Design a protein around this nucleic acid. Sequence first.
RNA 1: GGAAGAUGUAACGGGGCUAAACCAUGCACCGAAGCUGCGGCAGCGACGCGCGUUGUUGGGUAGGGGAGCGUUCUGUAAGCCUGCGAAGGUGUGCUGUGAGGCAUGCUGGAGGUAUCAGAAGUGCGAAUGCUGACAUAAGUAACGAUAAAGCGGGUGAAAAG
RNA 2: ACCCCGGCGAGGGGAGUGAAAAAGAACCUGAAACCGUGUACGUACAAGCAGUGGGAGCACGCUUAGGCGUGUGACUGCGU
Lengths: 142, 48, 117, 16, 110, 56, 103, 150
Amino acid sequence: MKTFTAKPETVKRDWYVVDATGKTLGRLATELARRLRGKHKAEYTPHVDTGDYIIVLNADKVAVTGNKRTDKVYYHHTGHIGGIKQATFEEMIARRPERVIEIAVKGMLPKGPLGRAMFRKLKVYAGNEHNHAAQQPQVLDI
Amino acid sequence: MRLNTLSPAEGSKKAGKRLGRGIGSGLGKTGGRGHKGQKSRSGGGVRR
Amino acid sequence: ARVKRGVIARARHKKILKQAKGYYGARSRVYRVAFQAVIKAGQYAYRDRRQRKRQFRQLWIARINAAARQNGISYSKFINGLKKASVEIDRKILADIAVFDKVAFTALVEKAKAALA
Amino acid sequence: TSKWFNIDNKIVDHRP
Amino acid sequence: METIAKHRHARSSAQKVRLVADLIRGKKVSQALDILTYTNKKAAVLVKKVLESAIANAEHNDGADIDDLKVTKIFVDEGPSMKRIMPRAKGRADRILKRTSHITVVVSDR
Amino acid sequence: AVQQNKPTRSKRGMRRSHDALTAVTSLSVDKTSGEKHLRHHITADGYYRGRKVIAK
Amino acid sequence: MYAVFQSGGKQHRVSEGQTVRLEKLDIATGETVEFAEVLMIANGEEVKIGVPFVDGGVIKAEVVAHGRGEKVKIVKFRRRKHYRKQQGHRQWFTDVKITGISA
Amino acid sequence: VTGSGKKPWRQKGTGRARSGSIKSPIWRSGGVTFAARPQDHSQKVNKKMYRGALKSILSELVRQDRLIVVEKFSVEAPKTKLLAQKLKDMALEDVLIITGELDENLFLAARNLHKVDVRDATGIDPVSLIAFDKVVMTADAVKQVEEMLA
RNA sequence: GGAAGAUGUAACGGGGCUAAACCAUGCACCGAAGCUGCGGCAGCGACGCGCGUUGUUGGGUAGGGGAGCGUUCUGUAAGCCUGCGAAGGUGUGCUGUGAGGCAUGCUGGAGGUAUCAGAAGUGCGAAUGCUGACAUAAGUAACGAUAAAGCGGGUGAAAAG
RNA sequence: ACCCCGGCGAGGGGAGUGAAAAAGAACCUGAAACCGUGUACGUACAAGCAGUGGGAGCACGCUUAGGCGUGUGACUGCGU
Ligand SMILES: N[C@@H](Cc1c[nH]c2ccccc12)C(=O)O
Ligand SMILES: [Mg+2]
Ligand SMILES: [Mg+2]
Ligand SMILES: [Mg+2]
Ligand SMILES: [Mg+2]
Ligand SMILES: [Mg+2]
Ligand SMILES: [Mg+2]
Ligand SMILES: [Mg+2]
Ligand SMILES: [Mg+2]
Ligand SMILES: [Mg+2]
Ligand SMILES: [Mg+2]
Ligand SMILES: [Mg+2]
Ligand SMILES: [Mg+2]
Ligand SMILES: [Mg+2]
Ligand SMILES: [Mg+2]
Ligand SMILES: [Mg+2]
Ligand SMILES: [Mg+2]
Ligand SMILES: [Mg+2]
Ligand SMILES: [Mg+2]
Ligand SMILES: [Mg+2]
Ligand SMILES: [Mg+2]
Ligand SMILES: [Mg+2]
Ligand SMILES: [Mg+2]
Ligand SMILES: [Mg+2]
Ligand SMILES: [Mg+2]
Ligand SMILES: [Mg+2]
Ligand SMILES: [Mg+2]
Ligand SMILES: [Mg+2]
Ligand SMILES: [Mg+2]
Ligand SMILES: [Mg+2]
Ligand SMILES: [Mg+2]
Ligand SMILES: [Mg+2]
Ligand SMILES: [Mg+2]
Ligand SMILES: [Mg+2]
Ligand SMILES: [Mg+2]
Ligand SMILES: [Mg+2]
Ligand SMILES: [Mg+2]
Ligand SMILES: [Mg+2]
Ligand SMILES: [Mg+2]
């Protein structure tokens, strides 16, 4: 018999919410990547988005180990010549930390339309309040 | 026994080589001659 | 006697284009480009038969890992327990059970845990 | 015939 | 009932008359006459002649009514091209393709 | 300069997508003669704003 | 009710009244075939799995078709090395009717 | 081929693939590469080989009963009707006659039938001996064929 | 620590990691076209009557050897198919290890050819190959002296000429 | 022939001849490149020899009402 494939219109996508106070950034990102990709579901297919929607609360209270609070430098390029930009971990926690979580998870995720869709399912909030209480999100323990 | 029942002896009618007639015939491209040199040139070779 | 190659060349080219039907642009119209496309298609078919076996095994392995981790055991310990319990059951079939009939898969999980214990 | 910038000498023999 | 009017070896370019035909495709007949009267193309003049040929063709040979006639299918195919010689600089010669076309209209009531 | 490769029919349609004609939006009708004409132009017979502008 | 068994180098999960693709068996085209090696039977919150074979669990089948599969073309090609190669292949198969799963 | 030995263009510079003659076999309306010449296609046959082949032909003819021997075979008048009626009486259709003495009467009788051929014993040949279905003998023809095959 | 480079981080592939780094030991698992299992083909050698048993082999350039497919023509053939539709053209289905083969729908309007033999102008993607046709740039450049035109009337289907 | 549109045109449509005008003189057959129109599907957050393995959906034929076949091919592994 043919191997089962999950149907993208019949797949059930649940809403999980995770508090990120004091958790390790990399290990939290690996766990969230597994959940968004759907590697925790027995009906996994690599070509169909089967994961879950995740809310991340208190993205500004993630912890990193060692000198990473000041030595971990994020680089990006503006496209114009000479336009390299650096931003350390502490200054982007100061500015906007949902990008720290999003950059980590986007790095863990695959590349293409499917990985972009899983990242779209990811929701990250900097504070301790989310607007998605109408979906009855259930708490996940990392 | 007619004119269309007469077959030659077995092995009496070996087919000749046809050089340069595709990959599968084994004699395509260079036609059993190698790569360059007087041996492969047209009318080439040395005397006896 | 003189031979004309029109009928035979037409038949060969039409065969190659019929194999090349469905390709983008000159790879389905122009004979030369179509012939280069068909040979690469055959190479890809060979190599992807082998990769089809590989990829389907990988997909089954990932599904077994997910189902066993829902049941509370890693994939490697699950397989070690199954081999100590001496069953020769296919990973394809275990993936099928994991998708469709959860209870039988759970039963295999406590058998694997008993064999590990 | 042939193009004048191929028949020419200064630009044809640029690297002698 | 389908009525067909063709102008074969139309002394114009297939691309230009296709531009005008794509302008007038699918419209009702009197409207298509207004676009063809007020579109500033020799292609528009040619396909206007062809279209009135189609309308009078249907009127005489089938007897369908002008109010419910509709141009349902218009398409231009490339006709044979007349080859010329255009002398260029330094002895060279180019070939001019004086392109023609075959213009076709199909008018119908239903 | 000159092309390094032949472009495609798809490329040709891409380029010619902006080259199609725009018809007249709507004509205007004479308030007296009832003849269709361009907006802000005289009629073929010689009317404009319902008044004879030219002879014949 | 369903059961997984092993035959022809594969393992198959079948049910009652099922049409099943095995490979060619050395048996007539209309005869009933007995399968003795059965891996596992699941019958709706009672399962019997063998280690590796179920004691007393057997399969009644009916061979209904012999045939050759779909032709696939094997193409080998070493580029610039003047090597080209073509071959065809059709694989034999049996269609069977799984008509009994008896524990 | 009618032409000239003039080089079609200069060897270098024009950008075309080089050519040296209008009559080259690559070129359209050019010569043939390995054009045929009038040749002889006949083959040498050894006398003993030819005689042994004839013996094998007549032996298998006797074996499969396509050989009919009559003591006398002639017609009174050169009438193809008389000849065809006589072979119809004998019930034979596609026949090779061989005769001891070349009889112009029956030869002119048999000239018009394309299924009936007539020959002398010195004129017999393997392709007709195999092609014609029923082949008939005169006794004198048998004697001289036997002595000339030895 | 010594330790500085030029488009852009840029000397873990990236994410990220205080282990997800390193060392020592162990048990697992993934992992190849390797090996095994099942089925199919072909070559070679032993074993008994072209067949069966068994073992083994089967990446391949230059090249050597073996066996074949197809096209035109000749004989078989004053035979056979064919206006109740040939060759050819265009689809579909089946079949073979392959070059291929067979059947039939439509077009077509007169030839074609089994079998077994025989002879080759016998198979093309390449030669800045030859010839014809058709694209590409592209409705782009240009419309050939910067002496120059404007208006009224006529003809005509239409007049800047 | 004749009729009709059309510039007393070019060209076309009817009528008629003809077995056939899908033989109309640009004339037996009429291939391919190339150019079109209609329908089915896909495509406007998406990076690369354009395929191949898997596969959703859609549309149409279906004759065990079961899946099949054809067309397309979102997404995806490999692939200069
Ligand atoms: N450059 C000039 C002079 C010229 C003509 N033919 C030439 C050949 C070679 C070099 C220069 C020329 C021109 O093109 O008219
Ligand atoms: Mg700076
Ligand atoms: Mg990747
Ligand atoms: Mg070789
Ligand atoms: Mg050499
Ligand atoms: Mg060398
Ligand atoms: Mg060479
Ligand atoms: Mg020489
Ligand atoms: Mg000839
Ligand atoms: Mg096509
Ligand atoms: Mg494998
Ligand atoms: Mg001059
Ligand atoms: Mg000649
Ligand atoms: Mg002699
Ligand atoms: Mg720098
Ligand atoms: Mg293992
Ligand atoms: Mg192997
Ligand atoms: Mg080999
Ligand atoms: Mg013949
Ligand atoms: Mg012929
Ligand atoms: Mg040749
Ligand atoms: Mg060619
Ligand atoms: Mg080549
Ligand atoms: Mg050109
Ligand atoms: Mg312009
Ligand atoms: Mg340009
Ligand atoms: Mg410009
Ligand atoms: Mg200009
Ligand atoms: Mg001028
Ligand atoms: Mg004037
Ligand atoms: Mg002027
Ligand atoms: Mg006329
Ligand atoms: Mg014709
Ligand atoms: Mg004729
Ligand atoms: Mg065509
Ligand atoms: Mg979209
Ligand atoms: Mg984006
Ligand atoms: Mg792109
Ligand atoms: Mg890739």
